[PDB]
RNA sequence: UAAAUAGUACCUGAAAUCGUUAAGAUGGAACGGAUUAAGAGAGAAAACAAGUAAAGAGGGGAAUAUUCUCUUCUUUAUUAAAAGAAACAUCAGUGAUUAAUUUAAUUUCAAUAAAGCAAUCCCCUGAAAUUGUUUUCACUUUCUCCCCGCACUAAUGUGGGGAAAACUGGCUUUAUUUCUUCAAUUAUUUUUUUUGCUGAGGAAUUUUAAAAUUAUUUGAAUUUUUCUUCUUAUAAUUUAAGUUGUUUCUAUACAGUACUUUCUUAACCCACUCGUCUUGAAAC
RNA sequence: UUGGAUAAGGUGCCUAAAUAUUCGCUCAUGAGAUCCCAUAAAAGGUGUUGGUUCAUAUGAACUAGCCCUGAAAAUGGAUGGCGCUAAAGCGGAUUACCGAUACCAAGCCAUAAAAAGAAGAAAAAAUUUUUUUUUAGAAUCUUUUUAUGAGUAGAAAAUCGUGGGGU
RNA sequence: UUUUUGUUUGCUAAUGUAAAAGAGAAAUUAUAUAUGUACCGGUACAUAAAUAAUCCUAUCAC
């Protein structure tokens, strides 16, 4: 069912799973388009692992923005200069390969910059 | 005695059905004494579903689902009801309230 | 103030505007492009002298008497506090089912229609509204149960706006006591609550 | 439909239509009980019904009769199996619908003191032309091997005696209460007496 | 617009312009339904396809 | 230009008056027509039907002639059948 | 020894598989698709609180090692506003409805209360003397009466044979239609009663013009006037120019039973092992 | 995706919807119940319904609807089952209904086409002054409009990752 | 068996509804007719013929 929250209108959840990935371990949950001949999914039988298509794509007016109504952006060491102007539009996430000292300085600068952080409590 | 009701009882049936073709969008509701469509149209009002739970949910043991009766269905006084959420099919046969207000 | 499209004569009412949205290119504009909206109007059979049934409030099923329109569509009612023991309740038409009995059809009730009408215009929606600082004081004590439920009651009693309406209801009840009380059947009609009996049928019964 | 249970007397009813109404009631979560199944009627000739049940008896799975389709002979279970076949019994909801139904041949005890209901969509006089052959299902059961009919009839007459006694006693009581009400009508005020007399209460 | 109304209801000078200008009407299914898509209208059996002359207005009033 | 809510050109009075410049004139004439008394028709109901007596006589005559022709056809067919009998 | 969960199969140690503990389910397949509901986990970046005064810890830079600034967190009281949802109302689109409606057309009639006509006759109809024209008899009501059966009936009456006028019925006159109908259908218009769903977008040189409404004024008009119309000039309203407002709740809290989400269970409906060559694959 | 209204087809239950109306026929001791579609004939019937032709309310001769015989195969068996006779059968007439990823209205995506483009202050909250959000100009782009949206073999575009290498 | 407080090491208090909101209603029986009353299947008289389209039963405190 479509989920409606504020202004972001999402049309689908339950990230799609590969056909037959239930009773076959070697088939991983990552989706693929089965080619086959009589492969059911291609025929689109009534109610059996319906496949992704273009129609499920959300609205580009709101597409990439996160429930924070704010696009996310990665940071590594000190790259906060391009964030000063658009503090109402871009949230910042620390890269997972950042040590505690650098992450501490980044969180210090960001908090006074007044920009939200996603993984604030990382490795501490 | 006490505990006035001022509502009518109704029974939940299957969803807006068709043989080997489901459509879990609406709900079918039958009422106490109505029998014709001409008298079924008399109801366009709010509906409250009440059910119990094994453990407390928000400080009480009871939570409810609202909805509105949209339009009569068929000729024998059965109505279609649209709720904020789909009724789980565990509910078939239980009693539901159609409230005089509105 | 009205507009007579197709002879409807709908009447207009001043309207405020508070919704704020960031506009397309640069700034933020007030959403409500309009300033006036047609009033609510009511069902054909709602008048001051009528008797009705409240349907949802915690006074469920009690019978009451219409009082006066409050310029907001929401109408004030009095189930006299010394007869039915019900306070003022600014409630809505579609929450308040009205019967077909008008209280002023009674010969000895028609005499106090003038006083009932003259006692109504004083009440208003800003009187019925709740005060912000009083709400704050009420919420302060949430952060023994008998103590808190007595605190809430006495705070609402000391509420400065309350006393006006309390006196108004006392006056209404004192005026309406004897003539209503002398009719035993009417008094019990106003005192008894309304249930639904399985023998009757809602759709086939006209209000 | 809206009571804790119904009890249905089966005097002069047709099996198919009765089963239809019963099953439709059952599928909406309502408990139904049927009594005096020995008086179920079937449209057709006695020998035609006998022939059809003879063919039913002829039918049996060859591999192992233990797994065979249970033929049954009791009229109550005949009606029960008809309703089961007519109701979607293979699902969980259908299983609940099937097992919400109870039936007992003849009268039992805990059901003779509750009001019986008759379904006007299955009465033989209404739904059959008087000149066409019909049947009594108890005789069919006896033919196909019930051997418990005369006992039910004797129990029926034994219950009938007590029923007549109770009915006469309650008729006496009701006729006394009516006199009490009519005599006490005039002790009330004129306004209340007119209120009663206007609507006949 | 009333010029179009007249130019249509009366067979006048201008059709190859107006009809080419006016997109094909998209019609809603009937309020009650057809009689039989599979049988002619003039057949004694109920049916719909064929020549309806003056009757088409009734079915248009539910087509709308 | 941006597409807006396409106003119903059949009931929305403002947009309908924009489309057809004379609609308010036509509706005012309709209101004036409908706002007449009932005594006029109450006393002209006969006056508008008694002057239909000549047409009623004509209709009686024409349908009478139709049925007369049909009856003559019936009688001629019956006579031909009697002749062909022997 | 930093680590022995690095202990000689010794860097990391997934999967098939197996073990333990916990939770759940278990009526001849299991697993699943779509919709939920209950449970069990987690979760603050929108899921309420900017600033304002005080004090604890820090910090910085400008001013010429002391002034000022900006301040970031813990506490205290000090107050916001806003966001979502629910309810109501309004509007627009979009339907479903429940009562209608002017004026015409189509052999409609039906009554009212005062006359007359006609007796197997009348408005109808039926059968007989290059088409139309004319003629004869034969047609109904009865609680009317006679003769035969005289009680024979389905019958509180009756079969058959005969008499009767004429309330019944039909026709031609006058005045009315509300005592009573003005039917049914089509053309041309008009409203109405109860309510479901949706609310896109956000207009710095077309969200303006006019379009309508009100209240003035202008001349005129005609269907002949309180929704009568056409503008001269004025100021706003919106039915114009895609849903706005009001009251609550979330909620006066920093993680919870609420709220969002993952997972497991169930529930109504559906679903035949894939890949393959093949006209034809789930295939015995 | 959200509502409305339908097609074929159904309205006893399974199975969402009419034991709906109304007009006739049918007793089957192997009734009958949709084209493809899952068999039935020659001949008959003093069963019953309606007709036509003749003879003096009767005799005969025909005529067509339903029904009966003809009518027999092997695991136990199928109008799909149950069952169905004032039908839930047959053949109509009538309305009301339920019924789609079809149709209509609205929203969103993508493709194609289309119209057009290489520089300025708005609002809110406190109290005139501060704070609060923006103040946009990227051509394989930005704004807007309309239409359409199925696919094996097959082709093309935008894409997402992997071992490396300059930058 | 009666009353109150509760069920908010693998454990050692502890909870679940296929259906409360007046979940009210006991004659049997035949359909081209029945049931009761007094007599000996019959005699005579009432009752019944839209039957639940009914009746009973709830608010008046303290």
From TrEMBL, chain C:
Gene Ontology BP, a term: cytoplasmic translation
Signal peptide: none
UniProt keyword Ribonucleoprotein, yes or no: yes
InterPro entries assigned to the protein according to its UniProt record, in alphabetical order: 60S_ribosomal_eL6, Rib_uL2_dom2, Translation_prot_SH3-like_sf
GO cellular component labels: cytosolic large ribosomal subunit
Molecular function via GO: RNA binding; structural constituent of ribosome
Homology family: Belongs to the eukaryotic ribosomal protein eL6 family.
Protein name listed in UniProt: 60S ribosomal protein L6, putative
UniProtKB/TrEMBL annotation, chain D:
GO biological process, one term: negative regulation of translation
Matching InterPro entries: Ribosomal_uL13, Ribosomal_uL13_euk/arc, Ribosomal_uL13_sf
Keyword Ribosomal protein: yes
Any single Gene Ontology cellular-component annotation: cytosolic large ribosomal subunit
Any one Gene Ontology molecular-function term assigned to this protein's record: structural constituent of ribosome
Pfam family, one: Ribosomal_L13
Keywords: Ribonucleoprotein, Ribosomal protein
Highest taxon listed in the record's lineage: Eukaryota
Name of this protein: 60S ribosomal protein L13, putative
Family as reported in the entry's similarity comment: Belongs to the universal ribosomal protein uL13 family.
TrEMBL record, chain E:
Family: Belongs to the universal ribosomal protein uL30 family.
Protein name per its UniProtKB record: 60S ribosomal protein L7, putative
UniProt source species: Plasmodium falciparum (isolate 3D7)
Residues of the full protein shown: 194 to 257 of 257
From TrEMBL, chain F:
Protein's UniProt name: Large ribosomal subunit protein uL4
Biased composition (Basic residues): 73-86
Family (UniProt): Belongs to the universal ribosomal protein uL4 family.
Organism superkingdom: Eukaryota
Residues of the full protein shown: 310 to 395 of 411
Organism taxonomic ancestry: Eukaryota, Sar, Alveolata, Apicomplexa, Aconoidasida
Species the sequence originates in: Plasmodium falciparum (isolate 3D7)
